[PDB]
Symmetry: D3
Subunit: 226 residues, 6 copies
Amino acid sequence: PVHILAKKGEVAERVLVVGDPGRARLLSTLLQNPKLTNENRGFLVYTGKYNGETVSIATHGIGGPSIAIVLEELAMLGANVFIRYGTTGALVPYINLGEYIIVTGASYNQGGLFYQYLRDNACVASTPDFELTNKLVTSFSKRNLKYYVGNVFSSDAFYAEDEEFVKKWSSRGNIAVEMECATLFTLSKVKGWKSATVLVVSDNLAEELEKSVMDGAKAVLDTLTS
Amino acid sequence: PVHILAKKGEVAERVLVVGDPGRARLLSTLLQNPKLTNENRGFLVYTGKYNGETVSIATHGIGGPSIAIVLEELAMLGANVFIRYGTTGALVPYINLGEYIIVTGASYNQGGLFYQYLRDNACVASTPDFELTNKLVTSFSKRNLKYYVGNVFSSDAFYAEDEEFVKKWSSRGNIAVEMECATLFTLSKVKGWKSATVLVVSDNLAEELEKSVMDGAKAVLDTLTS
Amino acid sequence: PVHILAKKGEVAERVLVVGDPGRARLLSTLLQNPKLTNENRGFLVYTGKYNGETVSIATHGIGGPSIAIVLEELAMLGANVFIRYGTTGALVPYINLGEYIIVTGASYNQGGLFYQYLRDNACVASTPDFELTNKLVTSFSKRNLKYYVGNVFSSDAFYAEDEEFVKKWSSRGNIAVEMECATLFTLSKVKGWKSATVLVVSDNLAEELEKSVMDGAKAVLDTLTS
Amino acid sequence: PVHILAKKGEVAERVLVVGDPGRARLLSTLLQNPKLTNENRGFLVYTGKYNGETVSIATHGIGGPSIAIVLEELAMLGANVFIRYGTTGALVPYINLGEYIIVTGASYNQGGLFYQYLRDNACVASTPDFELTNKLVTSFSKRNLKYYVGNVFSSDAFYAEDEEFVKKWSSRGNIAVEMECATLFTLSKVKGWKSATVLVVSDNLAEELEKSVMDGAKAVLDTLTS
Amino acid sequence: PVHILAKKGEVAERVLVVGDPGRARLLSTLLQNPKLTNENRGFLVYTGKYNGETVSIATHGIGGPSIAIVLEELAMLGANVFIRYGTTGALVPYINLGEYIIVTGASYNQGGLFYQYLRDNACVASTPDFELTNKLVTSFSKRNLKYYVGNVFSSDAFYAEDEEFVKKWSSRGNIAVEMECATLFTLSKVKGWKSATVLVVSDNLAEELEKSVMDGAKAVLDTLTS
Amino acid sequence: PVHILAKKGEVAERVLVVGDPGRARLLSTLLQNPKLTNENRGFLVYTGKYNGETVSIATHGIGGPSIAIVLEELAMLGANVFIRYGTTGALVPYINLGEYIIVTGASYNQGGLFYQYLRDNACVASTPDFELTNKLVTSFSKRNLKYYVGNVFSSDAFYAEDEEFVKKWSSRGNIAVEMECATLFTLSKVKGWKSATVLVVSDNLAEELEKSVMDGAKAVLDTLTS
Ligand SMILES: O=c1[nH]cnc2c([C@@H]3O[C@H](CO)[C@@H](O)[C@H]3O)n[nH]c12
Ligand SMILES: O=c1[nH]cnc2c([C@@H]3O[C@H](CO)[C@@H](O)[C@H]3O)n[nH]c12
Ligand SMILES: O=c1[nH]cnc2c([C@@H]3O[C@H](CO)[C@@H](O)[C@H]3O)n[nH]c12
Ligand SMILES: O=c1[nH]cnc2c([C@@H]3O[C@H](CO)[C@@H](O)[C@H]3O)n[nH]c12
Ligand SMILES: O=c1[nH]cnc2c([C@@H]3O[C@H](CO)[C@@H](O)[C@H]3O)n[nH]c12
Ligand SMILES: O=c1[nH]cnc2c([C@@H]3O[C@H](CO)[C@@H](O)[C@H]3O)n[nH]c12
């Protein structure tokens, strides 16, 4: 690995992955005896214990290209179970800020990264691990957290203009927009890793937030160690 | 409606859809007082009772174009819940003939039918209803049936050659091949229908068959009338 | 073959193919000593004689994927000359219901089936056999039937919405819309089969029918046996 | 028009188009009272009479973009019937040099010119006018000339390397390769022009020529004026 | 070589390429003892002296397919440095007729010629030789000529309609439109040739022309013989 | 802006952009009185003076999606001149480690980000600002630094397998591989920003390094303030 410099045996098999370096640090606090195993290129990685299991929390940055690099190197260091925990913008009216979205699949525009990895333009089913996702539902339900289950659109361009954006994607079965689930799910299927995702609704395109992010992390950590 | 000439209030809200008219007929013998509500163009549709609830069994033929038409017409006729039940070819070594596969997503090559409906070549997530699918898993498990859960490749060409066929699609996270799940799933997300799929393995690319079919149908019907 | 279970030696080299099973049964009365050689999956196939020659009438269902399978298997059973007879929707105002359209080519949206068979997205000329097509023109002329000669658009989505459908395809040299000639013409070119198509206009998007359907059928049988 | 600067009334409705300027000059001697109506950009255009009708012979250069411009402008000058006469490379072993190929359709790789004109990547049937094409067959038959009828591949890159060129295009129903009929057929279908093509086999990729070229030309002129 | 029939040692290493045979001839009067080394298919090529150095002026016709063939054959005949010199249509308001544009890159629609050469649809950078281009800027500046530097769109369809044409390509960083720079630049990068382009503005989409052409040619020739 | 929280009037019009957060900090040391204006999400941004001009050094992370977000927000805060300074892997043998590459254009696979921003799949010329790039050449030459001028390939997948990678891209006119130049150049052309790039060769796919990175930064800063 040339980006994540952690030592082999310093990254757990179970990994909670977030996009924001600051969130990684904030959440490392939920682990027992956390140790910073990497800071190179800004990708903060912490390793500690939880519910009697070793777990790592890693930063993946923004976008398909970035998370692909991070996931590939973590895997080379021993990780094989990944749970994405990030933020998202809801595409439907009935979902409120601070509530969660457990992802069942990801829509995406083809090309680039997908072409290079897949070899052609086939629309390969971009979905998470079935078993793991149900465990997420079970952990969020037990902690009495308000969530919804559905697909999301993994955009590559945050600021690209598209006047019919919300209508187009929501009419396509997607309930929220984010940027790296398609890459995670598809690469995981190709490489044989077990993956899933839960998102915190931070905006609706159709201190209370800190609480929401903290509560969701506990459910995810519970899942990762179940 | 110019293909399925059924009268008003003759098609149930819940529908078990199969590709072979032969199976539609055979399976209708599991209902209470089955009536043939359509035979036009060979698309057999039966409506009767099961566990006290009204339900229908319909023929969709082979291919995306065929099942799209049948689904659109049944929907106009009042249907909104669909569970496809057919046969598939495994793409992995460990699955035996007669066992079952509960579909979690569908891979496909873009163009044609998808382009006309979606209006562009975006890879929209082609997945079943989360809830309904979990119900199928429970039904099949309750009846002690052997099943696997995963994605499948929806092919458009039964006889097209591909020397790398099996390793290609199996390395892409697909455990079996069939021909209409992608159409069913995508159109359902767009139209707002609740769909799922269960397949009977009739061959593995990597009397006893009618019994396997019979047992699985009972589990599916328990789910539609649950 | 796994769909059409007729015994080799039960399928004629000359085949008239129709999408509707009902039409196959009705047109079999035009043959001498008709015999049912297959009913599996609703794909009715009748074989008999017509003016000194053995001829078969087969059902192909709806859509490219369906007719592809049927065509492949009939060929494996000995067929090499196919003339499709079906219904179509006129795209130009001057054509009346009941009249016929003798097809000279097919336009199609690429992808799926064509990609699997051709292996890339090249627009391979989808045309019928030149000779066989002129023989059809002669037969229809001999029976004093009104017809037009032109290209058609082979759609995959009967119900997909397109606010500019008629103008778009008519301005592209097409005079009618159907769903399987492009698959028929292309696969025939690749496999070495001799194929052609005549359609009955059942509606214009821009008793009488029975007789129309019957007269046309006689014209097709003459062509196949001259 | 900015390329062909002939005065309207100097271009016949009936036009025989050839890629080579030299060929245009040589074939003009076949007309009665030939007059040079344009030489701008090397696009030689001659107009005269042939068996009771006014006819023009025009140069179209090499490639789809070139012939597109020339065809558009000749039309703006009054032309509506185009018959291209050129050279071609046979893709099947049985065709000999000097023989002719009467084109029934054109295969092409999509993009560029087709995308700008059609506005998307649909594979619009690229075929000639059915009637005009049969008239050519009749003329060549009347002069006892040896010909074959079939599809051709319209290439854009004469020198691009493809180790499986012959096998690929021949297995796709094409019997020869050229460079501009696809552009000719498609634009004619969209613009409402009546077009056709006959080619002289100058080589097989799988004195005698002069006379071949001359006899064929007489056959084309008869067709254009009958 | 079957298009340009020049003898050995008749084509110079440096070549000024223009699309119009008329200009090739006219421009050859700026050379010392010009000789016509090819007229086949209308592709005029002259070779003579300028500022003591041997150089050639060649006709490439219209369109990517045409210029690709001419460039490949001149290269086989010994040429390896190419400077295209032609006319263009400005896409911005501030550029006046008669002024010049030194090309820094070329935009284009994929497919056709590019697919056959590149073997896939990757957007390969279509740019001129850095060094040669800087030399043109210096030559033109030394001769006090008014020029602009920027990218251009290489169209394949002079007459295709596009109501958003100007704002589309101008908003994409292109300041003018022509038809062969993309082919010239891309093929040069692939074959290892040194190319550049200078265009004379003959119209703006947002006697005195032959003088503008004459002045610019001198600057180009100074560059080729520099 | 929601990622870069700097205040308006806290980001300069001239910006040196690097991918690595650590490099940003390392280089801020070359500025007079540097001030950290942003740390959110790990995107370090410093603002200070150099050669009598205000300049900012900003972190862009890895990949097209990431840099697009950063560039768009910096622009909203007042930046309009960007010079990319990163690392790259050489695709040609003759380029040594620690030497530099001044970029003249970027090759890229289409789709995703480009599709969303461009609206279709046109291969838009992805090039830097002409004037700015020449100034880079002038600054590196004056500091006696060894550099090469050429195009690069902007990959989206660092670890995707491609056995013919070096040959394919180098034969396409690219001398090095990196990941965000295509996005920078194209977005800059669309938005009207002035951009350029210089890369430090850290690997060749065909303390001394610290010195190399430091020396190159001085040349870039000289350019940005010239
Ligand atoms: O519209 C949106 N709203 C809220 N969050 C996001 C996000 C996620 O948050 C990050 C933006 O900083 C991205 O990496 C992405 O995963 N994407 N799109 C949206
Ligand atoms: O490889 C295979 N094996 C077994 N069954 C199928 C099937 C399904 O069976 C039907 C006929 O083969 C199709 O409509 C399809 O859904 N497809 N592909 C395969
Ligand atoms: O618009 C239309 N009008 C009339 N007939 C058809 C048909 C044909 O009839 C069947 C569906 O009604 C298809 O298999 C097709 O061949 N398709 N589209 C049309
Ligand atoms: O392989 C070939 N053999 C013979 N003639 C041609 C031609 C025709 O001749 C010209 C180039 O020699 C083109 O304009 C084209 O129409 N193209 N390709 C071939
Ligand atoms: O819009 C335009 N205006 C002026 N000249 C051209 C040209 C160039 O002039 C030739 C004929 O129009 C072409 O080969 C092309 O290179 N293309 N497009 C335009
Ligand atoms: O093959 C390579 N070698 C050296 N550097 C790079 C880089 C650049 O370095 C970063 C990797 O950390 C990427 O953001 C990219 O711009 N990409 N590809 C290569």
